[PDB]
A paper describes a structure:
We adopted the Z domain of staphylococcal protein A and its affibody binder dimer complex as a model system. We next generated libraries at the interface of a weakly associating dimer (Z+ ZSPA-1) with micromolar affinity to determine if we could affinity-mature the interface by coevolution. To clarify these inter-residue co-variations discovered from the sequence data, we determined crystal structures of 10 coevolved pairs that spanned a range of cross-reactivities and orthogonalities (5 from LL1 and 5 from LL2). From the structures, we could verify clear compensatory changes between the residues showing the most significant covariations (13A-9B / 17A-31B) in both LL1 and LL2 library mutants.
On the other hand, B-FIVF, which has only a single amino acid change from B-FILF or B-FIVM, has poly-specificity and binds to both Z-A sequences (A-LIFFK and A-LILFK) with moderate affinity. Thus, the mutant LL1.c6 (LILFK/FIVF) can be a “bridging” intermediate to help explain the structural evolution of orthogonality through cross-reactivity. Comparing structures of LL1.c2 and LL1.c6 revealed that the single mutation Met32BPhe in LL1.c6 induced a noticeable geometric change by forming an enhanced hydrophobic cluster within the binding interface (Leu9A, Leu13A, Lys35A, Phe5B, Phe32B, and Trp35B). Due to the rotation of Trp35B and Trp35B-centered hydrophobic packing induced by Phe32B, the N-terminal end of helix 1 and C-terminal end of helix 2 of Z-A tilted 17° closer to Z-B. Furthermore, the compensatory relationship between position 17A and position 31B is clearly revealed from the structures of LL1.c1 and LL1.c2.
Numbering used by the authors:
A (entry chain A): 0 to 58
B (entry chain B): 3 to 57
Amino acid sequence: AVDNKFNKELQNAIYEILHLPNLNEEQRNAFFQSLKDDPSQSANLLAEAKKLNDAQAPK
Amino acid sequence: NKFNKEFSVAGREIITLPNLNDPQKKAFVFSLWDDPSQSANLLAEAKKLNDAQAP
């Protein structure tokens, strides 16, 4: 078991998601909540966030 | 459901502090995510640290 304070993957996911340019605030906060619900999903959620970011690129 | 508009404001405040490095900001962002009710203490701590690291 990995504790959240000792989980670099979780911490990096939160920080990266905070920076993504093409998400809206609702999406960002939903990701933050989903990470709280299950930190084991950090890799999946970060990948999902990046995919949505890229689909939502303005050009 | 604690990730709301106030949480957004605090995370933005942390990353805009100009003298913190990325590991520092990531750590404060984690602490805010871990306990959003501590935004006030954490934001003040981050600003203090920022000022300690000013050129």
